[PDB]
Amino acid sequence: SGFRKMAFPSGKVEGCMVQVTCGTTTLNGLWLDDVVYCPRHVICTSEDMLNPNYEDLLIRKSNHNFLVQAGNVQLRVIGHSMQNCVLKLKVDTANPKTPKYKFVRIQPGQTFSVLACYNGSPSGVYQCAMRPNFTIKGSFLNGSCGSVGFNIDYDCVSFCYMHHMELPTGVHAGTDLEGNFYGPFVDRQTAQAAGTDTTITVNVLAWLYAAVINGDRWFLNRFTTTLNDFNLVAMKYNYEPLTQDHVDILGPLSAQTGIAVLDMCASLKELLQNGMNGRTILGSALLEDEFTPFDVVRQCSGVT
Amino acid sequence: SGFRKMAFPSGKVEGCMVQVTCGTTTLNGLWLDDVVYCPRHVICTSEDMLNPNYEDLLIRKSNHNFLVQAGNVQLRVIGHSMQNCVLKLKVDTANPKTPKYKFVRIQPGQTFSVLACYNGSPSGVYQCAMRPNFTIKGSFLNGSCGSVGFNIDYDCVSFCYMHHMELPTGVHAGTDLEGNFYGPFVDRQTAQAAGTDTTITVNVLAWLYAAVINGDRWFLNRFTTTLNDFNLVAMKYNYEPLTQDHVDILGPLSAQTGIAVLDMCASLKELLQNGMNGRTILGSALLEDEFTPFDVVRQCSGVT
């Protein structure tokens, strides 16, 4: 019993983190096989970041301008290329700690662990979600750029995020490992505002199932609803519309608890309309939306 | 910017986790040098757990009854001893991934990361606190016993917790790595109730400093208080009494923000007396008490 915001174990990713220095800019890179991935802004001064021309900035950079350090051992750079908003630095040595891995571009509402790093050195690990507005709510200081987000399926690390930007509102923007930003964000120090931070409705419902499974049942009511009726309440409270896909995805939790998805929706509806009345659910005073149905099943069944 | 419930990177501890099987009981052990540490209840059936005599149960056990598996490689057990509520299994092979480590017995209010494991395989990592009632609020299924809690100071892992017990109220009890339970808990399936879960006042104040540092300032008020006046409000709300030691410990955060500790206490006092009025602080709708002053400084300054 107990339900906690749980990150994946970080060891497989710890073994991939390096320091990348270009001129006087230092951040983190990801060493997989004989390639180091890092944000392309490694070639910028903060002055450059106002209106960088990356192709032009890159022309002034050679392989030997990219200083790559893995602990206290320097890697030899034998090639460099820009792919979207990341640099791929070819090094002469395959990372011996390269795990089985994939690059995956995740959808909003999907969760992942972030290994926060400074100078190629891990500081900590936490769980995030790709927000419906394609921001993440991270913890990232200066030097944290190139820290990555990942899921692990048994032995295979799926890299889904690299950290690039803090918006002036203190939320976070970044790319997949092909260097494509999530959402409309750009690696430029400009006016970029996040859209509505909508709540991930299917994740709240998953978490409500998690609560029932772990003894927190006070919010279960005598009501049901329909997707259409629920969705009118969702709209009002800036919740993502619930689809039949989401209902289908909640089927296993539905089955395990014997609470029909639409009954749990009716529970959520009352909670949105009435608030918590100073009560808590799984030690939270608001509706948590950064556990997927998959996360709840995983943590409730003890997958490794 | 951003402030998250951050666990230490888990790789150094991942490399110490093994599976321990005695007869038909399987749980997790910690392999450091040529010793595997695991809960002594590894020798029990659930039937035994009602009134176990561990010394008597142990007499029926030989070195070869302790099956120790590190990934898919079996360790040879060359000795076994009971120390309090843990077994030390001497194996013929030093763990090659043994990090620099200490065993430390932590105080209530102190935080640590838990690497949840099943069959010696890591499932996830989360941050905990030793509660004033010597429970932790974990996420532990059957098979999770012998999962450990740790802090990391640069290269040195300080092991402070091994998981033994779930109380019928779904909170968690365990030992330090010398096998001494935190609090009055015992490795027996009996009537054990947790005392008052008091809030760790110094941790709430640290977290309020963290919020100010990261832009959340609405709860800052025009008031101050005294330790004695604050403590009357603390009592009423089941908060730990604040000591001059706690004020001293908050000095660096005080200095960095320019908010006197007693002014932040007055802020906390108003929040306790008035609630949040449906507002949030660092994305929480209640007062978080599982960040130490040390945690806030660490995460706000980017220590690795």
Ligand SMILES: *CC(=O)N(c1ccc(F)cc1)[C@@H]1C=CS(=O)(=O)C1
């Ligand atoms: C994103 C980051 O970590 N930093 C950075 C790097 C390059 C830029 F153009 C902007 C920001 C950070 C700033 C100073 S540093 O020490 O080089 C790293």
Ligand SMILES: *CC(=O)N(c1ccc(F)cc1)[C@@H]1C=CS(=O)(=O)C1
């Ligand atoms: C604590 C734990 O993980 N388990 C356990 C072990 C021994 C006991 F006496 C009680 C509980 C868990 C129960 C079954 S198991 O698969 O052996 C592990």
